[PDB]
Amino acid sequence: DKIVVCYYGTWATYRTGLGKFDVDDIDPFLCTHLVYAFIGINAEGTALALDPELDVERGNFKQFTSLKEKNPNLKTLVAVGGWSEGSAQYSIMAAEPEYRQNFIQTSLAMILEYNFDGLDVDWLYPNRRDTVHGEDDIEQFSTLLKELREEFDNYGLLLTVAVSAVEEAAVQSYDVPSVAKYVDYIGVMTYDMHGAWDSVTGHNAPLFISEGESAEQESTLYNVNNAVQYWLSAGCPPEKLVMGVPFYGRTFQLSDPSVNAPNSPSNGAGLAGPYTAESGYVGYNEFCYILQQESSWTVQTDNLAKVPYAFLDYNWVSFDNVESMTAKVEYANSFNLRGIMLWSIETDDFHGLCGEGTFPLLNTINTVLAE
Numbered sequence: 001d002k003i004v005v006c007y008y009g010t011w012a013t014y015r016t017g018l019g020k021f022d023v024d025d026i027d028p029f030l031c032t033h034l035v036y037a038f039i040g041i042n043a044e045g046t047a048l049a050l051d052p053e054l055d056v057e058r059g060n061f062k063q064f065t066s067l068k069e070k071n072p073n074l075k076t077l078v079a080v081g082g083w084s085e086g087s088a089q090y091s092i093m094a095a096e097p098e099y100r101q102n103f104i105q106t107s108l109a110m111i112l113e114y115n116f117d118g119l120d121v122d123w124l125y126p127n128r129r130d131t132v133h134g135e136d137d138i139e140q141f142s143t144l145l146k147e148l149r150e151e152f153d154n155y156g157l158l159l160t161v162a163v164s165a166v167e168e169a170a171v172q173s174y175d176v177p178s179v180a181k182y183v184d185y186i187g188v189m190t191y192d193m194h195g196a197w198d199s200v201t202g203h204n205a206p207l208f209i210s211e212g213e214s215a216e217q218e219s220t221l222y223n224v225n226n227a228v229q230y231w232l233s234a235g236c237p238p239e240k241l242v243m244g245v246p247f248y249g250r251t252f253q254l255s256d257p258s259v260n261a262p263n264s265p266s267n268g269a270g271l272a273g274p275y276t277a278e279s280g281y282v283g284y285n286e287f288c289y290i291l292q293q294e295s296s297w298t299v300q301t302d303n304l305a306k307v308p309y310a311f312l313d314y315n316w317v318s319f320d321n322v323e324s325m326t327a328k329v330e331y332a333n334s335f336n337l338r339g340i341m342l343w344s345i346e347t348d349d350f351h352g353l354c355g356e357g358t359f360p361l362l363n364t365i366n367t368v369l370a371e
Ligand SMILES: CC(=O)N[C@@H]1[C@@H](O)[C@H](O[C@@H]2O[C@H](CO)[C@@H](O[C@@H]3O[C@H](CO)[C@@H](O[C@@H]4O[C@H](CO)[C@@H](O[C@@H]5O[C@H](CO)[C@@H](O)[C@H](O)[C@H]5NC(C)=O)[C@H](O)[C@H]4NC(C)=O)[C@H](O)[C@H]3NC(C)=O)[C@H](O)[C@H]2NC(C)=O)[C@@H](CO)O[C@H]1O
Pocket: 007, 009, 011, 038, 050, 081, 082, 083, 084, 085, 122, 124, 162, 163, 164, 165, 166, 169, 189, 191, 192, 193, 194, 197, 222, 248, 276, 277, 278, 281, 343, 344
């Protein structure tokens, strides 16, 4: 059965006005799996709420899982880790049997108290960033998943992971067959392919080769097709591969506004959105409205990569719209993938300000998957 894995960045409740996105803004019938991001750990592996005022005191954990009262078939998971949590503590925790056991027991306790149906492990990433034990992380990550699976089978809980996409990244972190063996599915983060950290403009989630890229050694390029075909060939069965898609774009400052193709020189991060409020990225809800309200933007489609981009003076923006989302889900259908994972629900056009219905990206996913 095809699944739709909706990540919910819970900090979105602090956004103002039309950017505010609470648990009550979720449509629980547009997802099959809803993921509460994020919880974290300390250096001894103790699972902990990162925002206890919201998660615990104001009952956000329980409000989230209570969505099952509306859609009884919905699964609600909690996600541990993420970008801001780093890699060091997960490396330290994974390497010690005492710390693994403490992570298993304290995360299980939180999952059961607050009525979650499972755990999404988003360690970014084994043997990367500020990892402590380096290459040992790869095997110890799989040992952690095995001990988690052994504990979770006593309660019927789901165990899932979010992982880096392209081969150059994945080989640093995972033994693919061992990971796929223990999880219910693998959510491949097939986005952030390029971004403001690069010296040239590039697409956030290009499906295939992009304009300005060399067709020589195509398999080393950062795109969704390369990533998905890597993970399938490395040993992830299609029925455990969930393909990530972004509900946001990434923004660049052009070095020269007249050189505005993909793979043009860039000077760092571009505009920020009104609610996400970070230079270098913009929610789809924010940018479809920005495009709507300022006709000076030039929107083009990269017909090689199957994704749109837009420029105005010094701004250059890669993003995904209904057409590129359709292309992505059709691609996933065409390789019999298990489903779609989206980051993240709170930057869909949930108010429908952009003339394509409420939740146009999420509704597109549901519609193209259903067919
Ligand atoms: C091909 C290749 O390998 N390219 C890499 C590229 O991947 C690297 O970029 C990083 O990619 C990873 C995925 O592999 C990104 O991590 C994913 O994707 C989500 C969206 O990118 C990411 O969301 C971020 O989560 C942060 C928390 O961890 C959010 O911080 C929050 O900011 C809020 C204000 O906006 C604030 O209120 C919150 O308190 C704060 N949260 C916390 C707990 O502090 C951040 O806003 C959010 N970004 C969004 C929404 O756009 C997730 O963490 C993670 N998801 C999952 C499921 O794991 C990672 O974000 C990318 N890095 C950066 C810097 O963007 C790149 C590194 O430079 O290198 C390329 O080579």
